[PDB]
Design a protein around this ligand. Structure first.
Ligand SMILES: Nc1ncnc2c1ncn2[C@@H]1O[C@H](COP(=O)(O)OP(=O)(O)OP(=O)(O)O)[C@@H](O)[C@H]1O
Ligand SMILES: [Mg+2]
Ligand SMILES: [Mg+2]
Length: 152
RNA sequence: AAUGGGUAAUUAUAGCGAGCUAGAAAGCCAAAG
């Protein structure tokens, strides 16, 4: 639905996607990772340079956090005698792994010629032109290892 | 002095030993629906 079409359509709950404005809808703020720099079928012909030097290919990356449930569930018990194995640490860890992959991934794909098809929980699936997809995951992890101090 | 004979050495030497351009394209399919 569009913005002003909320006057027209009858609903019960409205979900708003990748937004922080208050607005008049009093909606529910979901966070779906999404980006398109172009259509999917143009990413092969976008792999050229300004010279013409590039192979007409498109790359696809599927990222995955390693041992995510093993770091969610147990996670913190290594430091101390176990005095950091609480709900609020894992609830903050719950946000910080969703705040990364569902919001911050569009900043990493700001001007890259790609399309994040899905990013959620641990998993990313992002088609795109091959120079940028290779540059995406190098730029994603080098951010994600600074986000987590090298762990996860 | 005549006369009988040739004898030894070298058997190639110094280099280059490949260079550059192309390294899969276009259809089917998928897209556009
Ligand atoms: N957003 C999330 N936050 C915390 N845990 C998650 C999230 N999404 C999935 N999981 C966890 O991931 C587990 C499934 O394993 P998954 O492959 O998804 O990641 P993993 O546990 O790190 O394993 P792997 O190393 O194979 O990726 C589930 O037990 C679930 O609890
Ligand atoms: Mg996982
Ligand atoms: Mg997983």
């Amino acid at each position: 639905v569009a913005f002003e079409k909320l006057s027209q359509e009858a609903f019960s709950r409205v979900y708003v996607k990748n937004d922080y404005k208050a607005g008049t809808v009093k909606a529910t703020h979901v966070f779906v990772g999404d980006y398109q720099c172009d259509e999917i079928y143009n990413y092969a012909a976008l792999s050229k340079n300004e010279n013409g030097l590039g192979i007409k290919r498109l790359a696809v990356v599927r990222l995955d956090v390693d041992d995510l449930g093993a770091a969610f569930m147990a996670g913190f018990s290594q430091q101390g005698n176990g005095q950091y194995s609480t709900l609020s640490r894992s609830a903050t860890f719950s946000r910080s792994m969703s705040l990364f992959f569902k919001v911050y991934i569009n900043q990493f794909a700001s001007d890259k010629k790609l399309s994040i098809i899905y990013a959620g929980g641990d998993d990313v699936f992002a088609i795109g032109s091959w120079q940028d997809i290779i540059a995406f995951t190098v730029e994603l992890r080098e951010n994600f290892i600074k986000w987590t101090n090298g762990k996860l």
